[PDB]
């Protein structure tokens, strides 16, 4: 019947325990979703080309030129940590868990409702809302992964993070192949670089439509749709960071002369002249064994060209790197490249009671020091005379190519067969949870956007759309805009995300770091006198672990 | 129930392979149909007589005189290729399949919605839309083919070709016997050529009515209708073409003197004088054996009176032919007769953002050379003396009947017991798929309008009508217009057409012609910036086959 | 996911582009560049890198003499001009046994 509810709201998190120190962390989320009728029932192919911004010499990083297909369908995405866990559950997870596995995922749409908007045309405007019990809501679940994978977490467009606030689905779109050339320049370049959009190569064209690819369920006010349980196969995720760098792998040298009295100035000493020492080095042409020169098992992290932009057929794009600066946790202004920056709105953490269109931003700094500090690096000649003369060293203050602001650290890559690095840490609340593995023959070792990556295939996207509510005046052969009764839908989305985690132990005398509420941050987790909520970012890998 | 959906939307084209190189093609096609109530609840017997146009001497070809019964019903017709396949599927079929079989067909009307229209009459105009749960959609399936068969592909009045675009059903009418006389004329005919219309013979009157011949289902908003699976019995269809003509049948003559260097001028010479040759010819009284005078196994194609008009009881009509002019591939303007021409609107291929009533058109230049090039013919005396003189050869340039424009090829026919010719190629998207065989004692060898011809029966036409939503002021004895509430219906139609195809094989060293996307035709298959779509025609017989 | 286009074209035309519609320093999104607020197609996070750059026409010496550092793939957009084949894309030289 029309008057029978078709599902249950549920936003609880249950930590069920098991053997050998494991726990099932089953997260339930539920939302009210508001879907207007699409601006047009038709697919569009649209190009963005901001020559007004890129023509200005030196702004070549500001290129937004792309081709996209705009669809009438809307995308429902719950792939963000903020959709499942409130700050307290995250506190429990990151204070008590060591490793986190992703097991299953579920979702269902229920309590569909459709309403039509009537305008009175009275001189003082007014309008009345009527239910359309016979109208339908179109739902398509792309379980075969045929449609382009468009994770909403990247553009800050996933479902909201507050159970008690309604949400909307992101309008759906996907990239269409294009060609583009943009020669970089500097304030001071002559003329105007070639800044052109060559078009789209026919052999690369791929136009998709939901109708021709996925079975679409027509859901009336008395219907409900459930996707069915999905089972992941992702690699484990560690909730502990690693503090060791190359300088701290292995056995320290024996300190022949320890301090005798305590004090800030009372350092220890090794007591053996460096050229006279015992051990192993790869620097086979010198006798010096030092903490900077002694052989180590392998290398942690890697140096990458920072703010390197690589051009391909589609134009320029920044080179991604796994980790950012090391030891930059003290200042946000020193985050530099690698360390992600999130800019989000009021559906996803910004103080809700705020106004204006300045997004709320933060830069994530991880606890792991697998990064680099290029100002401390240097390249010196193989003879290895010490102290080194100006001519035998390439310091970071020495220019490359004559540019005084560009040094070798900008064009210097140290990735090799000895590199060790960790996966990207989870970012709460705005971080994406999982991502799809690329369809390339050879695949990357990690993704920067999601802690979990999907070895074979993983959950299909869910698309919604208001069915066309035509007026009596429809006429297919007319080329004008289709006449639609102004219709909108509110429906309830409910999902289940099932994790499996292992509790942590204490391997050391000291207490490790933990997240805790303190006076400097208490108000960030409570509503305001006028009902304003905000979700601040929380670190994931608080606990430390031994690397080697 | 009112609040429960009674069906699911589906387009997906599913390829399922069998053993021995066969593949099942299941084509799901789903639309949203829009149906206003009929203009009059009564059947109408109507005459059209464009006497004004045909009174102009020489315009007899433009005769449009006929009598029809106009019915209060609307026909839902899915008998065209564009209703089932998008260009990608057509590409796959016509590039990989050598033959095609029609297997089964099903359809269903569901998710029925009925709405009424009310007008406020307020000084600023406005009108509201209300659902009517008690209102019914009348649906009739003519399973026994009682009603006259009337495919809509000939009028471009079938269901539309875009799943995301709603479609109308075509108002239904059929022919009513009439008598017509039209003496042909030329600009310069004195007076008025005899041009009269006589009416209907009593013995050919047939007033079919749906209500008295077909069960009718009354569907409310919560009902559904399923036709059931119809299974075809048509002869198999070929997606290949025959390039051979009589000149390419048999064993070519041995070349005693083969060429000795590459070049377009370095031809070979047979080497044996023409009356000294060996071989067989049907010319019982001449010693010449030549590639024209040699005996061939049979005749491929046939000549026919082109742009010839024949008259019967009902008036003049054009004589149909299986194939058109030969050599049209070199110049499209020379195709003319035989090669079909399709004029269609926006529902069925024309760009949907175009203005005006001028429809898109195209002539179909098939790949099969079973046609004729009448300017290349000649008829000469049985004596066969050469080089033939004027008195002894009937050249195509010779005048016939005192007319410069008419030569013998206009009246020439060479169909006979030795004729071998092909079935019509499918025309995507606007071609008709299947056609009902005539009920004559002797049946045509083929139909020019569809590749498949039903042997015993083929699926009943689906007739729809909005039930009469009468007002309170009804008076069955009234001669004035009946008063009905303005009702219209939106009902989803879902069809399944199932084919069986044979995959092709590489019979030759060289590659064959294949449909492909290129920098020219590229954007024909993708939507415009404002969403405009268009479907262009696409050939079907690109792969050559060996006739003999 | 492309960026939502807050203002779309209204007629067909070579110049009728679309527009993201939001000032760049005011865009929501995620980027690896932690010391800027500009979010742009060149700067927005992507899962990984498709293809890689190499010191093209590098010659490297070993015990047996110099050899060209091989690379997996060639130029992008070279399909439109043979003069830009450059490194990566192989060149075959052959005779009458083989074509």
């Amino acid at each position, epitope marked *: 019947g029309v008057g029978i509810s078709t599902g249950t709201f549920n936003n609880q998190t249950e930590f069920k325990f098991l053997e050998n120190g494991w726990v099932y962390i089953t997260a339930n989320s539920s939302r009210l979703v508001h879907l207007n009728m699409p601006e047009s029932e038709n697919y569009r192919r649209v190009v963005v080309n901001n020559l007004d911004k890129t023509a200005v010499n030196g702004n070549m990083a500001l290129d937004d030129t792309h081709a996209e297909i705009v669809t009438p369908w809307s995308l429902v995405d719950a792939n963000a940590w903020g959709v499942w866990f409130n700050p307290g559950d995250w506190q429990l997870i990151v204070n008590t868990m060591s490793e986190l596995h992703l097991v299953s995922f579920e979702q269902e749409i229920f309590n569909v409702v459709l309403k039509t908007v009537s305008e009175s045309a009275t001189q003082p405007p007014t309008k009345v809302y009527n239910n359309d019990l016979t109208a339908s809501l179109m739902v398509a679940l792309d379980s075969n992964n045929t449609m382009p994978f468009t994770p909403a977490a990247m553009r800050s467009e996933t479902l909201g993070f507050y159970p008690w606030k309604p949400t909307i689905p992101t309008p759906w779109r996907y990239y269409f192949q294009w060609d583009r*050339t943009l020669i970089p320049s500097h304030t001071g370049t002559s*003329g105007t670089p070639t800044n052109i959009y*060559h078009g789209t190569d026919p052999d690369d064209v791929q136009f998709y439509t939901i109708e021709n690819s996925v079975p679409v369920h027509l859901l009336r006010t008395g219907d409900e749709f459930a996707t069915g349980t999905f089972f992941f196969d992702c690699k484990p995720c560690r909730l502990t960071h690693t503090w060791q760098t190359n300088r701290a792998l292995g056995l320290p040298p024996f300190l022949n002369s320890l301090p005798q009295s305590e004090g800030g100035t009372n350092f220890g000493y090794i007591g053996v002249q460096q050229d006279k020492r015992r051990g192993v080095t790869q620097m086979g042409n010198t006798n010096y064994i030092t903490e900077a020169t002694i052989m180590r098992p392998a290398e942690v992290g890697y140096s990458a060209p920072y703010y390197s932009f690589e051009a391909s057929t589609q134009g320029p794009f920044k080179t991604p790197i796994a980790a950012g600066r090391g030891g930059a946790q003290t200042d946000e202004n020193q985050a530099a490249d690698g360390d992600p920056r999130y800019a989000f709105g009021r559906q996803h953490g910004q103080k809700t009671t705020t106004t204006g269109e300045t997004p709320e931003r933060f830069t994530y700094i991880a606890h792991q020091d697998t990064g680099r500090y290029p100002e401390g690096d240097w390249i010196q000649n193989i003879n290895f005379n010490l102290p080194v003369t100006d001519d035998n060293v390439l310091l970071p203050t020495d220019p490359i190519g004559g540019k005084t602001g560009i040094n070798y650290t900008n064009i210097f890559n140290t990735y090799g067969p000895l590199t060790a690095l960790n996966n990207v840490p989870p970012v709460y609340p705005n971080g994406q949870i999982w991502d799809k593995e690329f369809d390339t023959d050879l695949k990357p070792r990690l993704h920067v956007n999601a802690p979990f990556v999907c070895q074979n295939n993983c959950p299909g996207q869910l698309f919604v759309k208001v069915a066309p509510n035509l007026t009596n005046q429809y006429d297919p052969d007319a080329s004008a805009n289709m006449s639609r009764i102004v219709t909108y839908s509110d429906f309830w989305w409910k999902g289940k995300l099932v994790f499996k985690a292992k509790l942590r132990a204490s391997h050391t005398w000291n207490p490790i770091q933990q997240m805790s509420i303190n006076v400097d941050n208490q108000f960030n987790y409570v509503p305001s006198n006028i009902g304003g909520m905000k979700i601040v970012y929380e670190k994931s890998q608080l606990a430390p672990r031994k690397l080697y | 129930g009112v609040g429960i959906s009674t069906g699911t939307f589906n387009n997906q084209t599913e390829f399922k392979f069998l053993e021995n190189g066969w593949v099942y093609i299941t084509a799901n096609s789903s639309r949203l149909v829009h149906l206003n109530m009929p203009e009059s609840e009564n059947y109408r017997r109507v005459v059209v007589n464009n006497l004004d146009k045909t009174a102009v001497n020489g315009n007899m070809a433009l005769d449009d005189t006929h009598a029809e019964i106009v019915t209060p019903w609307s026909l839902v017709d899915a008998n065209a290729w564009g209703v089932w396949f998008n260009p990608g599927d057509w590409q796959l079929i016509v590039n990989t399949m050598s033959e095609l079989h029609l297997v089964s067909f099903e359809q269903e009307i569901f998710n029925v919605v009925l709405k009424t229209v009310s007008e406020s009459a307020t000084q600023p105009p406005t009108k509201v839309y209300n659902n009517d749960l008690t209102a019914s959609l009348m649906v009739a399936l003519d399973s026994n083919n009682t009603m006259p068969f009337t495919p809509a592909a000939m009028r471009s009045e079938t269901l539309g070709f875009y799943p995301w675009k709603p479609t109308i059903p075509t108002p239904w009418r059929y022919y009513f016997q009439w008598d017509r006389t039209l003496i042909p004329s030329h600009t310069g005919t004195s007076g008025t050529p005899t041009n009269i219309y006589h009416g209907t013979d009593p013995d050919d009157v047939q007033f079919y009515t749906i209500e008295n011949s077909v069960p009718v289902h009354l569907l409310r908003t919560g009902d559904e209708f399923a036709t059931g699976t119809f299974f075809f019995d048509c002869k198999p269809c070929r997606l290949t073409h025959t390039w051979q003509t009589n000149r390419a049948l048999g064993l070519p003559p041995f070349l005693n003197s083969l060429p000795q260097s590459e070049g377009g001028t370095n031809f070979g010479y047979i080497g044996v004088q023409q009356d000294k040759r060996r071989g067989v010819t049907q010319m019982g009284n001449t010693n010449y054996i030549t590639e024209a005078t040699i005996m061939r196994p049979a005749e491929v194609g046939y000549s026919a009176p082109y742009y010839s008009f024949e008259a019967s009881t009902q008036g003049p009509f054009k004589t149909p032919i299986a194939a058109g002019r030969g050599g049209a591939q070199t110049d499209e303007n020379q195709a003319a007769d035989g090669d079909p021409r399709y004029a269609f609107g926006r529902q069925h291929g024309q760009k949907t953002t175009t203005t005006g009533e001028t429809p898109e058109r195209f002539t179909y230049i098939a790949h099969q050379d079973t046609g004729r090039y009448p300017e290349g013919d000649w008829i000469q005396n049985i004596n066969f003396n050469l080089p033939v003189t004027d008195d002894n050869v009937l050249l195509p340039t010779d005048p016939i009947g005192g007319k410069t424009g008419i030569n013998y090829t206009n009246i020439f026919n060479t169909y006979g017991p030795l004729t071998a010719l092909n079935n019509v190629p499918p025309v995507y998207p606007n071609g008709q798929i299947w056609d009902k065989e005539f009920d004559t004692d002797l049946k045509p060898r083929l139909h020019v309008n569809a590749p498949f011809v039903c042997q015993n029966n083929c699926p009943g036409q689906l007739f729809v009508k909005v039930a009469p939503n009468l007002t309170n002021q009804y008076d069955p004895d009234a001669s004035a217009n009946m008063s009905r509430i303005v009702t219209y219906s939106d009902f989803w139609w879902k069809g399944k057409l199932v084919f069986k195809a044979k995959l092709r094989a590489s019979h030759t060293w060289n590659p064959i012609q294949q449909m492909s996307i290129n920098v020219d035709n590229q954007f024909n298959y993708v939507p415009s910036n404002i969403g405009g779509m268009k479907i262009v025609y696409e050939k079907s017989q690109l792969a050559p086959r060996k006739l003999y | 996911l492309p960026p939502f286009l807050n203002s779309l074209p209204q007629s067909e035309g070579g110049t009728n582009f679309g527009y993201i519609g939001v000032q760049q320093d005011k865009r929501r999104g995620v980027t690896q560049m932690g010391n800027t607020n500009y979010i742009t197609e060149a700067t927005i996070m992507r899962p990984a890198e498709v293809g890689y750059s190499a010191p093209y026409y590098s010659f490297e010496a070993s015990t047996q003499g110099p050899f060209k550092t091989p690379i997996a793939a060639g130029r992008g957009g070279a399909q439109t001009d043979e003069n830009q084949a450059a490194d990566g894309d192989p060149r075959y030289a052959f005779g009458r046994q083989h074509g």
Partner: antibody, heavy 126, light 109 residues
Framework: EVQLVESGGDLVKPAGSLRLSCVAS????????MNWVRQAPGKGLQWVAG???????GYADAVKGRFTISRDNAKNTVYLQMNSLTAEDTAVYYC????????????????????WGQGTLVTVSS | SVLTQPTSVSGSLGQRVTISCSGS????????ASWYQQLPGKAPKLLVY???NRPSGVPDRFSGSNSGNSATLTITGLQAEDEADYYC???????????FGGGTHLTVL
């Protein structure tokens, strides 16, 4: 090297029509747009029309709605049908090809460059 | 739309000379000028691209510059053969049409 040739310019009466032709070799005709540019005796230059690879066309207001430009990619030939000619159309017409490969509706017909052909003269009078 | 140019310019043999063209934000301020040279009765040949580069075989004498809504062309080591008419060219981003300047004649003394 890029070579272009033109033909079809002739003295013609006002109104009516005239049809120019330009042919190309040495470059991939498909990947490049083609443009006509005209110059009256002793006067300045004026772009006439351009046609990208996909059949999309562009025109200047002085001819928009009067002339129709096209291509035949199979013959490296471009045509300009000049209907409704008037005396002001008397000028020399040149055939050009842009520097940078380009196709589609959003493609600028002519930015900078072209190995302009020798050109064809046109006069409208009676 | 149209680009402004000077009517004529003069220069002595071996000296340097300059020519200027003016436009608007949507023609020059976005796409730089491209300079063409036309000999008496011949089809014009380009001298300098908007890219700032010159075609193969063009003497190094010519060079171009751009500033805001205007552009400029210069000839170093003026020669007798350089006496010709010159034209600036750009692309009106609003009308989507190539815009050619009014032309300039250079006199060599």
């Amino acid at each position: 090297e890029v070579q272009l040739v033109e033909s079809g310019g002739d003295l013609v009466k006002p109104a009516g029509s005239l049809r120019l032709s330009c042919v190309a070799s040495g470059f991939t005709f498909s990947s490049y747009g083609m443009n006509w540019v005209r110059q009256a005796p002793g006067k300045g230059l004026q772009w006439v029309a351009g046609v990208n690879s996909g059949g999309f066309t562009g025109y200047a207001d002085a001819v928009k709605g009067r002339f129709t430009i096209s291509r035949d990619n199979a013959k490296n030939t471009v045509y300009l049908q000049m209907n409704s000619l008037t005396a002001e159309d008397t000028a020399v017409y040149y055939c050009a090809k842009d520097r940078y490969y380009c196709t589609g509706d959003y493609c600028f017909n002519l930015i900078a460059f072209g190995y302009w052909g020798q050109g064809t003269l046109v006069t409208v009078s009676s | 739309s149209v680009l402004t140019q000077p009517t004529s310019v003069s220069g002595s043999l071996g000296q340097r000379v300059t020519i200027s063209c003016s436009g608007s934000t949507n023609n020059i301020g976005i796409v730089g000028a491209s300079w063409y040279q036309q000999l008496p009765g011949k089809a014009p040949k380009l001298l300098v691209y908007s890219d700032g580069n010159r075609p193969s075989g063009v003497p190094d004498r010519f060079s171009g510059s751009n500033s805001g809504n205007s552009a400029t062309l210069t000839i170093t080591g003026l020669q007798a053969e350089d006496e010709a008419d010159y034209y600036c060219q750009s692309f009106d981003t609003t009308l989507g049409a190539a815009v050619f300047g009014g032309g300039t004649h250079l006199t060599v003394l």
